[PDB]
Design a protein around this nucleic acid. Structure first.
Ligand SMILES: [Mg+2]
Ligand SMILES: [Mg+2]
Ligand SMILES: [Mg+2]
Ligand SMILES: [Mg+2]
Ligand SMILES: [Mg+2]
Ligand SMILES: [Mg+2]
Ligand SMILES: [Mg+2]
Ligand SMILES: [Mg+2]
Ligand SMILES: [Mg+2]
Ligand SMILES: [Mg+2]
Ligand SMILES: [Mg+2]
Ligand SMILES: [Mg+2]
Ligand SMILES: [Mg+2]
Ligand SMILES: [Mg+2]
Ligand SMILES: [Zn+2]
Lengths: 230, 97, 204, 121, 98, 129
RNA sequence: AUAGCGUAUAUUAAAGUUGUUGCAGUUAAAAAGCUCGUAGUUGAACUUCUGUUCAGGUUCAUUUCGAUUCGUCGUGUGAAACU
RNA sequence: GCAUUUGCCAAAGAUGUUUUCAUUAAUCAAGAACGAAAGUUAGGGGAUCAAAGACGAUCAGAUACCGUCGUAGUCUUAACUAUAAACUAUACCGACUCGGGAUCGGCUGGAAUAAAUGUCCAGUCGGCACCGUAUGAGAAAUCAAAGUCUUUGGGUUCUGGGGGAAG
């Protein structure tokens, strides 16, 4: 049953090779409702040579307990980070009874939570976005990560925890300033991820002008959306 | 004071351009017209309205005008007044017989 | 006094006591209101009503497919009208009183839907609906009275969403106009479907 | 403790839903129908469904039936008897305005057109 | 942490409010805080009035027996226990005059 | 009481762009407040602006484009040798791309950057980006 | 880790855990019970603005010109600001 | 901390100002004025309640929670004592920013009666307080400020730096 049965109008448009450009999906803010929606863009042909190589990674797996009438009910929560060291990142955590299930669950929770990590230059705009255009900050309950631009080579000056999330973003060089509580690894990753996400959120001047008016990919493919469903 | 307003939309919006005058920003995001904020990659509550163009006879023309309204402004119950004004701007809200 | 088209629109609008609203002014609705009644009643400016109905129409016109517009209502009053409106406009709507929380968020509802434009009769009554509209990037048009969460609503049609006389007629006027723009009718020409149909009937 | 399992209720509901016309006000006759109409394993359970389904029959002899839909049968014949008008209760010709209304109209400038105002002592 | 906004009392401007003795324990309680419910009590029970009306005497202005006037002041401590005000749930704690 | 109205006016304004105000009324205004303003204006942060003549000390109204991210002052306006610059550029500014640290000089008031051109600078005044 | 490697003690960083930058202060430590008040610290707004023209570079832009090559110069405009 | 009437004595806010004066100001070590109770010294006064005490009862134990009494105090004059969960446990001055009615004081327009030191409608300064809500803050409880702080800087005073030993 490895058959993709779209359940959204997006899962639809995508499965049928339309709008094939992940970022085109973000531009329009098309809520990533399905998990395959991402599986589509990243081909499992494994030509072991391109960075676009989607990377699924687990980080934390913890036992969570609820006390109950002569019973300690134990379950597990896990955090998976998804990413192409090319400019997209997704954090996902899931809780479940049997561990393996949490993992495969978080693998997916991580996909729907995909975010565009805008890169940039510090100074001479040579050839490749090594850092972030500006400094950004990650908040999580009580966690504080600060992402700061850097020189080339001075690559990722963060904890083993954020560092991991950063690489999966494609960020090559950045200083990090962390504030308050880190053992709370869940909150830590969430902060790095949130920070990295707030990259696009930051309205800089080198944007400023006026957007290129376009049409919602729905009002464009309207006709289609009624073919296979009929 | 139209002043500042006309001038910000003035030229085209183009992200991080390098010495080699190349665009790099993976994609150029939609910008809220009444506020000039950036519409997220996952901005749930932000919407793009599609309004249609009419042709001096009560008929409708295969032409639409779009209005991007960010999340917050839509949340403060602005939209109705926000839109009703982006339409004054693009000469349209006042609908003459 | 534009052509008679406008003349009559206001005659009927004026007819259905649409300008008469509750004694509660949501500051948000400040502009859309007109003369504050002595008796305590609040009166809406009609130009806004008419004026807005036009936008409402023009935005529904924007839609490529007709079923991508969703008409929602809870009240028994607009229940009648909305159903007819949905009929003549060829757009989706449901009779079930309850909204069924998840209809727009959750893709497993029996009534799941993903409209491109939303029309609610009351920002109060269908507050649940608008609440979800907020999650799917779908804009809303609604009949708003002097008191109503003008939040998360893009197109306002200030009127008396109380008496069906009012409600239904606004729905009618919208469709009659929707028809015109679409090309299902001619600008001038008269609609041969009395506003009466949309009236909430209470058989024995 | 004579209450009905959900299944018992669903059955009676859906049976009545499909065969309303045929269903009688007599349990025995109906029980026979219910049995000839579907798969009721337990002979006993069959009755329960009919005994209760029969109950609903007498509650529809009233009309207010939450949970049940009698489309073609009733619900629709309902529309066929309620759509004959003659003159829109709204007279586009002559219309009336009161103090307030006219007050708003005189501001709008539409104060007076083809609609007459009436004073009261 | 904090449980109430008014902590049970209504002292909103001044720094100190008169103390009053509890109708039931006699305990001293700040006026504003303590519970109150000045009630209009009736002299005799239901069916018992009719018995005093027939054997009544003086004129009959239809004004019956004078009703008793009880100005009630309970301190929390016993007010509760005395079925007056039952420990209410979370959000119902802000409800006034149910 | 009041102090460094440049700060009074400045935050009142930030609070503006941050709240999404369409325009702002700054109450206590001075030459400084205005110069800073035309410097932000000149660099393209704020829109057209009008100074009303309060017969006491003018009131200004600034139109809000929507590009101001933050614009504040700096507590005591320390002195800053040209050598003290990178310290503050890496300190106050969100990048090596929005250089706007307004300073006071003897050569008037210049952009964080212009001060390197004129080659002098001096005391810090405020920042905007 | 490796001709090096443990250990003890003082000391630097991690210490935004002594904090000008850069902390905290309802409940976690922490606003004094409250007022007056010289030292100290901190203080509203105005005083040639501005315009025209010339010039030297500077930059940046370029439906553009002359040179050179593996990346610069000269020329013209506009513009800004400097002077 | 302050609630019986009335009369004096000096004082205060807010509102109202087309009145003057024109930086006179914000906060503050020193340094002072206050500061329920309880308590202290020397006199008054002594009704009620009542620490200690004397008794009953209750208990396995009760010099404790109930009950009967009772001294100091509680009241006052004049001295002295300064602490209290002296609590909003949230320093003062200043500017901003959401919605909404209801309040207390002053003022300005208006309407009805009536011509009332009244009532209502509408403004509006200033004062307790509440309701709703935040793509603002937080560890959270919660906060319209506990907000405008990693996009880290209006002015100033005081305080803290694992716990117990310890104020
Ligand atoms: Mg740390
Ligand atoms: Mg006290
Ligand atoms: Mg070692
Ligand atoms: Mg009295
Ligand atoms: Mg003393
Ligand atoms: Mg004595
Ligand atoms: Mg015994
Ligand atoms: Mg006694
Ligand atoms: Mg008056
Ligand atoms: Mg009033
Ligand atoms: Mg904090
Ligand atoms: Mg939060
Ligand atoms: Mg609140
Ligand atoms: Mg700080
Ligand atoms: Zn008691």
């Amino acid at each position: 049953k490895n058959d993709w049965q779209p359940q959204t109008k997006l899962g639809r448009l995508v499965k049928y090779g339309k709008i094939s450009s992940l970022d085109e999906i973000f531009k329009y803010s098309i809520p990533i409702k399905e998990p395959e929606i991402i599986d589509h863009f990243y081909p499992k042909n494994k030509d072991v040579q391109a960075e676009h190589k989607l990377m699924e990674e687990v980080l934390q797996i913890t036992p969570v307990q609820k006390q109950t009438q002569a019973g300690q009910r134990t379950r597990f929560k896990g955090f998976v980070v998804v990413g192409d060291s090319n400019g997209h990142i997704g954090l996902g955590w899931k809780v479940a009874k049997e561990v393996q299930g949490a993992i495969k669950g978080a693998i997916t929770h991580a996909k729907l939570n995909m975010v565009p990590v805008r890169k940039g230059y510090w100074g001479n705009k040579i050839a490749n976005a090594h850092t972030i255009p500006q400094k950004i900050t990650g908040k999580s309950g009580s966690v504080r990560i600060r992402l700061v631009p850097a020189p080339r080579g001075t690559g990722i000056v963060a904890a083993p925890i954020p560092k991991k999330v950063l690489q999966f973003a494609g960020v090559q060089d950045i200083y990090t300033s962390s504030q308050g509580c880190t053992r709370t690894r869940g909150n830590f990753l969430k902060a790095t991820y949130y920070a990295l996400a707030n990259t696009y959120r930051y309205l800089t001047p080198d944007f400023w002008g006026k957007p290129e008016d376009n049409e919602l990919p729905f009002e464009t493919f309207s006709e289609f959306l009624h073919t296979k469903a009929q | 004071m139209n002043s500042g307003r006309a001038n910000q939309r003035s030229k085209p919006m183009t992200g991080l351009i390098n010495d080699k005058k190349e665009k790099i920003d993976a994609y150029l995001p939609r910008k809220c017209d009444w506020s000039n904020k950036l519409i997220f990659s996952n901005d749930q509550s932000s919407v793009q309205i599609a309004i249609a163009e009419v042709g001096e006879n009560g008929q409708a023309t295969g032409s639409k005008t779009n209005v991007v309204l960010c999340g917050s402004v839509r949340s403060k119950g602005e939209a109705h007044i926000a839109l009703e004004n982006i339409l004054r701007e693009r000469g349209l809200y006042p609908i003459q017989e | 006094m534009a052509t008679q088209r406008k003349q009559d629109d206001i005659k009927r609008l004026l007819a259905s006591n649409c300008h008469q609203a509750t004694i509660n002014l949501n500051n948000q609705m400040k502009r859309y209101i007109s003369h504050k009644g002595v008796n305590g009643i609040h009166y809406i400016n009609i130009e806004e009503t008419w004026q807005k109905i036009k936008l409402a129409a023009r935005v529904i016109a924007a839609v490529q497919h007709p079923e991508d517009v969703m008409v929602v209502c809870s009240r028994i009053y607009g229940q009648r009208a909305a159903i007819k409106f949905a009929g003549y406009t060829h757009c989706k709507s449901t009779s079930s009183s309850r909204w069924t929380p998840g209809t727009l968020t959750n893709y497993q509802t029996l009534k799941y839907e993903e409209p491109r434009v939303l029309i609610v009769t009351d920002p109060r009554s269908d507050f649940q609906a608008i609440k979800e509209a907020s999650y799917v990037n779908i804009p809303v048009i609604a009949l708003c009275d002097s008191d109503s969460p003008l939040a998360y609503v893009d197109v306002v049609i200030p009127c008396n969403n109380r008496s069906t006389e009012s409600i239904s007629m606004i729905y009618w006027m919208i469709a009659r106009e929707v028809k015109i723009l679409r090309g299902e009718l001619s600008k001038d020409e008269e609609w041969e479907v009395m506003v009466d149909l949309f009236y909430h009937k209470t058989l024995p | 403790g004579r209450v009905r399992t959900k299944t018992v209720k669903r059955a009676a509901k859906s049976l009545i839903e499909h065969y309303y016309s045929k269903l009688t006000n007599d349990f025995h006759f109906n029980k026979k129908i219910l049995s000839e109409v579907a798969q009721v394993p337990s002979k006993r359970l069959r009755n329960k469904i009919a005994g209760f389904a029969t109950h609903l029959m007498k509650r529809i002899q009233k009309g207010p039936v939450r949970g049940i839909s009698l489309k073609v049968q009733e619900e629709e014949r309902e529309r066929r008897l309620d759509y004959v008008p003659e003159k829109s209760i709204i007279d586009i010709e002559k219309v009336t305005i009161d103090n307030e209304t006219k007050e708003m109209l005189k501001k709008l400038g539409y104060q007076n057109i083809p609609g007459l105002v009436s004073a009261s002592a | 942490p904090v449980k109430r906004r008014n902590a049970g009392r209504s002292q909103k401007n001044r720094g100190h409010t008169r103390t009053v003795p509890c109708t039931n324990c006699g305990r001293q309680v700040a006026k504003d805080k303590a519970v109150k419910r000045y009630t209009v009590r009736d002299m005799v029970d239901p069916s018992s009035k009719r018995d005093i009306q027939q054997k009544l005497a003086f004129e009959n202005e239809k004004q019956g027996i004078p009703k008793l006037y009880v100005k009630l002041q309970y301190c929390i401590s016993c007010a509760i226990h005395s079925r007056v005000v039952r420990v209410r749930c979370a959000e119902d704690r802000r409800i006034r005059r149910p | 009481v009041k102090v460094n109205i440049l700060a009074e006016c400045l935050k009142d304004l930030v609070n503006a762009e941050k709240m999404g105000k369409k325009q702002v009324l700054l109450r206590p205004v001075s030459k400084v407040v205005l110069k800073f303003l035309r410097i932000m204006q000149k660099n393209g942060y704020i829109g057209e602006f009008e100074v009303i003549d309060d017969h006491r000390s003018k009131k200004v109204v600034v139109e809000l484009i929507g590009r101001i991210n933050k614009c504040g002052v700096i507590s005591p306006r320390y002195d800053v040798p040209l050598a003290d610059f990178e310290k503050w550029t890496n300190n106050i500014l969100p990048s090596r791309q929005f250089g706007n640290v307004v300073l006071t000089t003897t050569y008037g008031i210049l952009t964080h950057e212009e001060c390197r051109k004129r080659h002098t600078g001096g005391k810090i005044l405020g920042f905007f980006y």
